[PDB]
Amino acid sequence: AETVSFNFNSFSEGNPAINFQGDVTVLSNGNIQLTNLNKVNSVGRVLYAMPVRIWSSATGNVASFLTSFSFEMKDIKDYDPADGIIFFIAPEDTQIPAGSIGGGTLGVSDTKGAGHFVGVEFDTYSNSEYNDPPTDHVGIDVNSVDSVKTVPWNSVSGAVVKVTVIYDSSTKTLSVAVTNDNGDITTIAQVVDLKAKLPERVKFGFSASGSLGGRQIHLIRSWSFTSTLITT
Amino acid sequence: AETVSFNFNSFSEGNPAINFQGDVTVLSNGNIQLTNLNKVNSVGRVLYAMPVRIWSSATGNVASFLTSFSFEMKDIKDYDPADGIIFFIAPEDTQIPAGSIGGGTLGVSDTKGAGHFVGVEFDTYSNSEYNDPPTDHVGIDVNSVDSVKTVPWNSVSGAVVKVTVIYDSSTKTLSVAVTNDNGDITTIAQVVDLKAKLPERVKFGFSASGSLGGRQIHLIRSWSFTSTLITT
Amino acid sequence: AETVSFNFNSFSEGNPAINFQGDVTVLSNGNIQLTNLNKVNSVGRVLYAMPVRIWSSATGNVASFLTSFSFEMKDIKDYDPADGIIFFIAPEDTQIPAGSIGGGTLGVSDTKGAGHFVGVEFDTYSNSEYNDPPTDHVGIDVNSVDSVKTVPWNSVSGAVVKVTVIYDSSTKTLSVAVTNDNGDITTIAQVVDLKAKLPERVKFGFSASGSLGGRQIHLIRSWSFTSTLITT
Amino acid sequence: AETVSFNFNSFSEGNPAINFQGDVTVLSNGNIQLTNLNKVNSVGRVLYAMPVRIWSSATGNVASFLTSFSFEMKDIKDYDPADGIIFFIAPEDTQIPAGSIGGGTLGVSDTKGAGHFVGVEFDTYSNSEYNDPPTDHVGIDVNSVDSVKTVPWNSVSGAVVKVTVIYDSSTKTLSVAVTNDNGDITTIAQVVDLKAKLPERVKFGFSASGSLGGRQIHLIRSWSFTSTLITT
Numbered sequence: 001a002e003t004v005s006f007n008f009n010s011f012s013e014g015n016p017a018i019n020f021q022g023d024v025t026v027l028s029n030g031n032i033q034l035t036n037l038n039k040v041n042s043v044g045r046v047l048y049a050m051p052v053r054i055w056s057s058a059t060g061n062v063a064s065f066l067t068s069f070s071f072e073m074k075d076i077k078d079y080d081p082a083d084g085i086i087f088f089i090a091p092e093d094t095q096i097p098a099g100s101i102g103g104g105t106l107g108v109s110d111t112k113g114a115g116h117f118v119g120v121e122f123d124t125y126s127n128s129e130y131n132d133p134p135t136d137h138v139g140i141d142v143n144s145v146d147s148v149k150t151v152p153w154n155s156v157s158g159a160v161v162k163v164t165v166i167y168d169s170s171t172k173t174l175s176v177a178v179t180n181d182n183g184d185i186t187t188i189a190q191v192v193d194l195k196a197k198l199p200e201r202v203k204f205g206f207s208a209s210g211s212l213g214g215r216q217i218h219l220i221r222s223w224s225f226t227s228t229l230i231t232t
Numbered sequence: 233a234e235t236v237s238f239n240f241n242s243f244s245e246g247n248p249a250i251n252f253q254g255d256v257t258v259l260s261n262g263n264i265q266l267t268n269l270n271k272v273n274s275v276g277r278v279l280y281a282m283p284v285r286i287w288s289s290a291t292g293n294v295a296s297f298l299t300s301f302s303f304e305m306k307d308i309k310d311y312d313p314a315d316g317i318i319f320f321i322a323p324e325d326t327q328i329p330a331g332s333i334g335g336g337t338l339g340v341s342d343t344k345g346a347g348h349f350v351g352v353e354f355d356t357y358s359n360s361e362y363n364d365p366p367t368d369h370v371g372i373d374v375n376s377v378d379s380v381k382t383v384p385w386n387s388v389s390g391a392v393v394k395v396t397v398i399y400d401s402s403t404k405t406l407s408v409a410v411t412n413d414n415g416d417i418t419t420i421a422q423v424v425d426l427k428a429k430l431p432e433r434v435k436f437g438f439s440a441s442g443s444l445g446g447r448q449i450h451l452i453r454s455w456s457f458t459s460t461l462i463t464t
Numbered sequence: 465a466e467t468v469s470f471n472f473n474s475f476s477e478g479n480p481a482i483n484f485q486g487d488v489t490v491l492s493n494g495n496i497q498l499t500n501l502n503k504v505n506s507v508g509r510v511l512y513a514m515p516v517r518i519w520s521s522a523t524g525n526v527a528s529f530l531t532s533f534s535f536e537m538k539d540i541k542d543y544d545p546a547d548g549i550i551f552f553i554a555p556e557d558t559q560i561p562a563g564s565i566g567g568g569t570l571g572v573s574d575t576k577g578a579g580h581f582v583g584v585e586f587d588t589y590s591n592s593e594y595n596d597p598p599t600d601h602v603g604i605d606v607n608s609v610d611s612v613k614t615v616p617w618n619s620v621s622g623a624v625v626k627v628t629v630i631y632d633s634s635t636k637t638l639s640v641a642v643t644n645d646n647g648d649i650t651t652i653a654q655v656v657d658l659k660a661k662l663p664e665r666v667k668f669g670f671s672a673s674g675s676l677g678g679r680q681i682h683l684i685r686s687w688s689f690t691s692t693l694i695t696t
Numbered sequence: 697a698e699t700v701s702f703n704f705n706s707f708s709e710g711n712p713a714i715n716f717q718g719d720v721t722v723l724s725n726g727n728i729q730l731t732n733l734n735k736v737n738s739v740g741r742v743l744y745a746m747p748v749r750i751w752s753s754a755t756g757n758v759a760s761f762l763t764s765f766s767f768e769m770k771d772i773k774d775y776d777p778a779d780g781i782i783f784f785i786a787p788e789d790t791q792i793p794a795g796s797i798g799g800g801t802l803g804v805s806d807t808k809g810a811g812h813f814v815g816v817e818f819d820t821y822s823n824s825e826y827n828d829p830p831t832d833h834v835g836i837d838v839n840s841v842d843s844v845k846t847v848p849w850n851s852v853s854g855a856v857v858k859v860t861v862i863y864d865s866s867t868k869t870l871s872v873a874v875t876n877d878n879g880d881i882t883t884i885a886q887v888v889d890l891k892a893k894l895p896e897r898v899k900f901g902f903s904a905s906g907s908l909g910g911r912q913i914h915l916i917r918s919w920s921f922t923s924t925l926i927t928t
C-alpha cells in the first residue's frame with residue numbers, strides 16, 4: 001500500500017513542505033494567516049507541496065484518508081467578519097483564479113462561483129449570488145461555492161475550532177465533524193466520487209478571502225493527514 | 233441543543249462516570265483491562281454511566297456524534313490471541329448476555345450471535361459460525377456479530393491503535409478511521425439508522441471476550457466523545 | 465487525573481444529565497424554573513445526574529472544582545419576593561427533606577434549619593429563626609441554613625446574575641464571585657473541609673423554595689462545571 | 697461602590713487603554729506577544745493604563761476582584777522553552793527592573809529575585825537560584841520570584857490556557873483556577889494582604905522573559921477584569 005503521512009503542530013514560512021499563494025503570511029507563533037487585513041479582495045492559500053496520488057488509472061483504486069486540523073476566525077474593528085476558510089483538494093497545478101474578486105469565491109472559484117476543486121467550507125457570510133443559506137454554515141463543495149450540501153453553524157470570534165474529516169474510498173463518503181467552542185459538535189457528510197471529479201494526483205490545502213468591506217483574521221493553527229491507496 | 237461530552241486520558245476504579253461489567257480491572261497505569269487472563273469464557277465490558285439521548289420521539293431529531301479512542305491487544309504465552317474488542321451502543325439496561333459463552337460473541341451477543349446493539353468490532357479470530365472473513369478485520373455490526381460489513385485489518389501484538397468514529401445523523405452514516413502501527417489508515421463506513429434500531433436512550437462502551445484456549449490482553453488506553461441533539 | 469466536565473447553555477425536559485425534584489419545570493426558552501408560583505411551600509431542585517467522586521478513601525486526595533452559573537429572580541404581583549436560590553452539594557441519595565416547609569429552609573433543610581449539604585445561598589428574605597442578616601445576602605452554608613458566613617447583597621428583580629465558584633482542595637477554600645446587573649462584584653470565601661463534611665460521592669445542584677406569602681420567579685439560565693481529582 | 701470593569705477580546709497597537717513596555721508587540725490577529733525570539737535576555741510587559749484603587753486610606757476598605765484571561769506558550773526550534781508568563785499587580789509607576797537579566801526574574805524582579813509586586817506565575821523553567829520546584833508550575837509571588845506557594849503544572853506547547861482569579865478582600869484570599877488543554881483544572885490559593893504589600897492605586901498586567909539559550913513564544917489572547925471597592 002502507498003501512504004502519505006505528515007503532522008504540523010506549527011508552520012514556518014521557510015519550509016519546503018508547504019507552498020504559499022497570494023497574501024499568506026506565517027506569524028511568529030507558527031500560525032498561518034491567510035488574508036491581509038489592509039488589502040481589498042484579499043486571497044491567501046496554502047498547499048502541501050508534495051502531490052498526493054488519490055487514485056490509480058492502472059488499478060482503478062481510490063485512496064482513503066483521515067485528516068484533522070484546527071483554525072481560528074476573529075472579527076476586526078469596523079469590517080464585516082467575512083468571507084471564511086475552505087479546506088480544499090484540487091489538481092497539482094492549482095493557482096488562485098486569475099483576476100480573483102475574493103469574497104464569496106473563498107479564493108478557489110471565479111465570479112460565477114465555478115472552479116476545479118472539492119472542498120469543506122466554513123462560510124461566515126451569506127452570498128445570494130451563490131445561493132448561500134441565511135446563517136453561518138459548513139458546506140461540502142464540488143467544483144462550486146454553491147454547496148452540494150450545507151449545515152447551519154456559528155462562527156465565534158477568537159474561538160479555536162477542531163475539525164475531523166474521514167474519506168472512505170469504498171462508500172465514496174466524505175464525513176466532517178466540527179467541534180465548536182461551546183462544546184457542541186456539527187456534522188455533515190456527502191457522497192463525493194473523487195475519481196470522477198478530480199485527477200489522479202492532487203494537492204491538499206486551505207484558502208480564505210475577503211472583500212472591500214468584508215474582512216476578518218483567518219488562521220490555520222495545526223494540520224495532520226494520513227492517506228492510504230491500495231496498490232495490489 | 234443537548235450535548236454530552238467527556239474525555240478520559242486515564243481511568244480509575246470507583247470513578248462513578250463508568251460502569252464496570254464482568255471481568256474488568258483497572259491497571260496502575262490507568263489502562264482498563266477488559267478480560268481475565270485466568271478465566272474461561274472471560275467477558276469484560278465498560279460503559280459510560282450516563283445514558284445518552286440519541287433521538288427524540290417528540291421532534292423526530294437524531295443526534296450526531298464524534299468519538300476517539302485508543303486500544304492495545306497483546307499476545308499471552310500458550311493461549312491463542314483471541315477474541316477482540318468491540319466498541320458498542322446498546323439500550324441503557326444492557327448487561328452481559330445471560331450464560332455468555334464469550335469468544336466470538338465479543339460479550340455483546342448470544343451463542344447464535346444475535347443481540348440488541350450497534351457496534352464497531354476489532355476482530356482477531358475467524359469464527360465460521362458468525363461468517364467471519366478469513367483474516368483479522370474491522371467490522372460494522374447491527375444486532376449481530378455476523379457483520380453488516382467488514383474491512384481487512386491486522387492486529388499487531390503490543391501495538392497502540394488509534395480509532396476515530398463519526399456518526400452524521402442527516403445521512404445516517406457511521407464512519408470509522410483506524411490508524412495502524414505501520415503508518416497506514418484503514419476505513420469502513422456504513423449507513424445505520426440508529427432511530428430504527430435503538431431506543432431513544434442508550435449507553436456507549438467497550439466489550440472484549442476470550443474462550444478456553446483463546447485468551448489475550450485487551451486494553452482501553454483513552455476515550456473522548458461528543459454528541460449533540462437538536463432540541464425543540 | 466480524574467476529571468468531570470459539563471456545560472449547559474440551555475436546559476430541556478427529558479435530558480438524562482439532569483434529575484428534576486419537586487416543582488421544577490423547564491420553560492420554552494430553555495430556562496429552569498425552580499418554584500410553582502400557585503403552590504404553598506413550593507420547593508424545586510435540579511441535580512446533575514452523575515455522582516461526582518469529590519474525594520478518595522484510598523489516596524486521601526480531595527478534588528478541586530470550578531463552576532459558573534447564571535440565575536434570575538423576579539418579583540410577582542401581590543406576593544413577598546421570597547425565598548431565594550441555593551447552589552448545593554449533598555450525598556448522591558439526596559431528596560427534598562420529608563414534609564418540607566419550604567420558605568427559609570431553601571428546600572435543603574428541616575424546620576430547625578438542619579441538613580446534610582454544603583452550599584452557596586442567594587437569600588432574599590430575612591428569617592430570624594435561622595439568624596439571617598437584616599438585608600439580602602450571599603451565604604456559605606455547612607449542614608445548616610444558619611450560614612457559617614454571609615455578605616450583604618442586593619437581589620434586583622428581573623436582573624441576570626453571574627456567579628463564579630472556585631474550590632481549592634489544598635487550602636480547602638471555597639471562593640465565590642457574584643456579578644450584579646449594574647456591573648459591581650460581591651465576594652465571599654470560607655474554608656470548608658469537604659472530606660470531613662461530605663461523603664466520597666456527591667451530587668451537585670440548585671434548589672429554591674417559597675412559602676404561603678413569600679413567592680417569586682426562581683430561574684437557572686446556564687451552568688458550567690469542571691472538577692479534577694489527582695489519582696496518585 | 698467604586699467599580700473598574702473592562703473586556704479585551706483582542707488587542708491593538710494604537711490603544712491608549714494599554715501601556716506597552718520593553719520587547720512587547722501586537723500581532724495582526726490581535727494577540728499580544730510579550731518576548732522577542734531574536735533578542736538575548738528579552739523582557740516585555742503590558743499594563744492596563746488606568747490605575748486601580750485597590751484600597752482606600754479614607755475608609756480602610758479593600759477591593760475584591762474577579763479576572764479572567766487566556767494565554768499561549770509555544771516552543772521554538774533550538775531554544776529551551778522558557779521562561780514563562782506572570783500576571784502581576786504593582787505600583788502605578790512600575791517599569792522593567794533596570795539592567796534586567798530576563799530569564800528567571802520573569803521581567804518583574806532583580807538578579808536576586810526581589811521586586812515590588814504581587815503575582816500569579818506560569819513558570820516553564822526550574823531556576824535553583826530562586827528555589828523553583830523541579831517541574832513546570834503555577835506560583836503565588838509576593839515581592840519575589842521565590843514563590844510563597846507553588847502547584848505542579850504542565851505547559852503544553854501551542855495550547856490555549858484559561859485562567860480565573862478571585863481575590864476576596866475580607867479573607868485576603870487570592871484563588872486561581874487554571875484550565876489545561878486536556879480538560880483538567882489546576883488550582884492554587886494563598887492568603888495575600890494586598891493592603892500591606894501594595895500601595896492605594898496600582899497597575900495590573902502581564903510580563904514574560906527569556907535569556908541567551910532560554911526562549912519561547914509568550915502570547916496574551918484575551919483579558920476580562922472587574923474590581924469593586926465599597927465606598928461606605
Ligand SMILES: C#CCSC[C@H]1O[C@@H](S[C@@H]2O[C@H](CO)[C@H](O)[C@H](O)[C@H]2O)[C@H](O)[C@@H](O)[C@@H]1O
Pocket residue numbers: 312314315334335336337357359442443444445446447
Ligand atoms: C484445528 C482447529 C481449530 S481449534 C478450535 C478450538 O475452538 C475452541 S472454542 C473457540 O476458541 C477460539 C480460540 O482458539 C476462539 O476463542 C473462538 O471464538 C472459540 O469459539 C474449542 O473449545 C476447541 O475444542 C477447538 O479446538
Ligand SMILES: C#CCSC[C@H]1O[C@@H](S[C@@H]2O[C@H](CO)[C@H](O)[C@H](O)[C@H]2O)[C@H](O)[C@@H](O)[C@@H]1O
Pocket residue numbers: 544546547566567568569589591674675676677678679
Ligand atoms: C408580623 C410580621 C411578619 S410577616 C411573617 C409571616 O411569615 C409567614 S411564613 C414566612 O413567610 C415569608 C414570606 O413573607 C418567608 O417565605 C419565610 O421564609 C416564611 O417562613 C407566616 O406564615 C405568617 O403567619 C407571617 O405573618
Ligand SMILES: C#CCSC[C@H]1O[C@@H](S[C@@H]2O[C@H](CO)[C@H](O)[C@H](O)[C@H]2O)[C@H](O)[C@@H](O)[C@@H]1O
Pocket residue numbers: 776778779798799800801821823906907908909910911
Ligand atoms: C550547566 C548547566 C545547565 S544549562 C544552564 C544554562 O543557563 C544559562 S542562563 C538560564 O537559561 C535557562 C534556559 O536554559 C533559563 O532561561 C534560565 O532562567 C536562565 O537563568 C547560562 O547562560 C548557561 O551558561 C547555562 O549553560
Ligand SMILES: [Ca+2]
Pocket residue numbers: 083104123124125126127132
Ligand atoms: Ca458566503
Ligand SMILES: [Ca+2]
Pocket residue numbers: 315336355356357358359364
Ligand atoms: Ca471473531
Ligand SMILES: [Ca+2]
Pocket residue numbers: 547568587588589590591596
Ligand atoms: Ca432567608
Ligand SMILES: [Ca+2]
Pocket residue numbers: 779800819820821822823828
Ligand atoms: Ca523559573
Ligand SMILES: [Mn+2]
Pocket residue numbers: 121123132133137139145147
Ligand atoms: Mn456558502
Ligand SMILES: [Mn+2]
Pocket residue numbers: 353355364365369371377379
Ligand atoms: Mn467478526
Ligand SMILES: [Mn+2]
Pocket residue numbers: 585587596597601603609611
Ligand atoms: Mn440566609
Ligand SMILES: [Mn+2]
Pocket residue numbers: 817819828829833835841843
Ligand atoms: Mn517559579
